[PDB]
From a paper:
FtsZ is an ancient, filament-forming, tubulin-like GTPase protein found in the vast majority of bacteria and archaea, where it acts as a central component of the cell division machinery (1–3). Here, using X-ray crystallography of Staphylococcus aureus FtsZ (SaFtsZ), we reveal how an FtsZ can adopt two functionally distinct conformations, open and closed. The closed form is found within several crystal forms of two nonpolymerizing SaFtsZ mutants and corresponds to many previous FtsZ structures from other organisms. We argue that FtsZ’s conformational switch is polymerization-associated, driven by the formation of the longitudinal intersubunit interfaces along the filament.
Specifically, two SaFtsZ mutations, F138A and T66W, were designed to inhibit SaFtsZ filament formation on the basis of equivalent mutations inhibiting the assembly of Methanocaldococcus jannaschii FtsZ (M164A and T92W, respectively; polymerization inhibition of T92W [unpublished data]). Both mutation sites are located on the “top” surface of FtsZ, in the N-terminal GTP-binding domain, and are part of the longitudinal protofilament interface seen in crystals. For easier reference, the five SaFtsZ structures are named herein in the form #XXx: number (1 to 5), mutation (F for F138A, T for T66W), monomer conformation (O for open, C for closed), and finally the arrangement of monomers within the crystal (m for monomeric, f for filamentous, single protofilament and s for split/domain swapped). The conformational switch does not appear to involve structural changes around the phosphate-binding region of the nucleotide-binding pocket. We know that our mutations compromise filament formation, and we obtained crystals where these mutant SaFtsZ proteins adopt the closed conformation and fail to form bona fide interfaces. Hence, we propose that these closed forms correspond to the conformation of monomeric SaFtsZ in solution. The fact that the phosphate end of the interface is not formed in any of the F138A closed-form crystals supports the idea that it is the closed conformation that is not compatible with the formation of bona fide interfaces, not the mutation per se—because the F138A mutation is within the pseudointerface.
Numbering used by the authors: 13 to 201, 209 to 315
The structure:
Amino acid sequence: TLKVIGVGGGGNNAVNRMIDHGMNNVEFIAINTDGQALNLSKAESKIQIGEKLTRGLGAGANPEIGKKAAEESREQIEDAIQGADMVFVTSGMGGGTGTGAAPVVAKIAKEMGALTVGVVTRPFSAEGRKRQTQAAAGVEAMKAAVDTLIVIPNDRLLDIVDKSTPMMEAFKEADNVLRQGVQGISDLILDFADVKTIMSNQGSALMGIGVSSGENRAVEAAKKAISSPLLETSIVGAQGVLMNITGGESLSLFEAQEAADIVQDAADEDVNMIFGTVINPELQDEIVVTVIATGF
Ligand SMILES: Nc1nc2c(ncn2[C@@H]2O[C@H](COP(=O)(O)OP(=O)(O)O)[C@@H](O)[C@H]2O)c(=O)[nH]1
């Protein structure tokens, strides 16, 4: 039983990209201070927070607003999570809602016993350093709050998207990245207790994405993932690695083994590696290798 919660406008856009993209397994939850944004959210469940602080508007960008706003609506949050086994808290740090509220939403789910995984974006360093300063705090808030935290610095997406890609639209790929991050894990649900062993109380986790379509797609996707810009360090330091190989109908068993072997070689000699495949019909010909490394 899986529930992904979108905390903030950033998170809610990533949640709505997770919905627009066919994703059949999981419950979606939208959390914001802004009433407007919640209306545009595609999630089944929505939650407005700070209904007494904000009077039904947004948190207007200060992290102190969401923190207290979350506490105000702690009741409703605990209700929405009830009986989820694993919770994904997807949010953009730097904002008001996410920065303060999302860490509280997390520790709610951790205190409720669900496996809490945090998939959060850092803001672009091109977004002003004040917003970067707040995000740095919010990140450290979540590190305490979650079992595993996957922190994707948006700047590292500048090593992915075009220079032509507008700034206010570069978040659409950041959406897609959070999608692949959550979806990579969620799609594999392997033994749940195995995943627990990889995620439970591990802390800071790195993500690696690689996509390839060609002659050598298996090898080419795994190599790209092993050395994804999103990885702050190469994964050899990790004690636990989860790996996903998502492909079309044409996805070979051979290809899976090839990609698995490649990633295994890159990981520590005696790493706890667990990996699975996913046939996703909607995929044309590209396969996607998603690497989550834990424990640093
Ligand atoms: N993935 C994603 N990230 C975003 C989007 N818009 C903004 N962000 C990032 O998320 C951070 C917070 O934005 P926002 O969610 O509006 O703040 P909040 O509403 O106070 O939680 C910013 O620093 C942005 O870098 C979006 O549409 N998608």
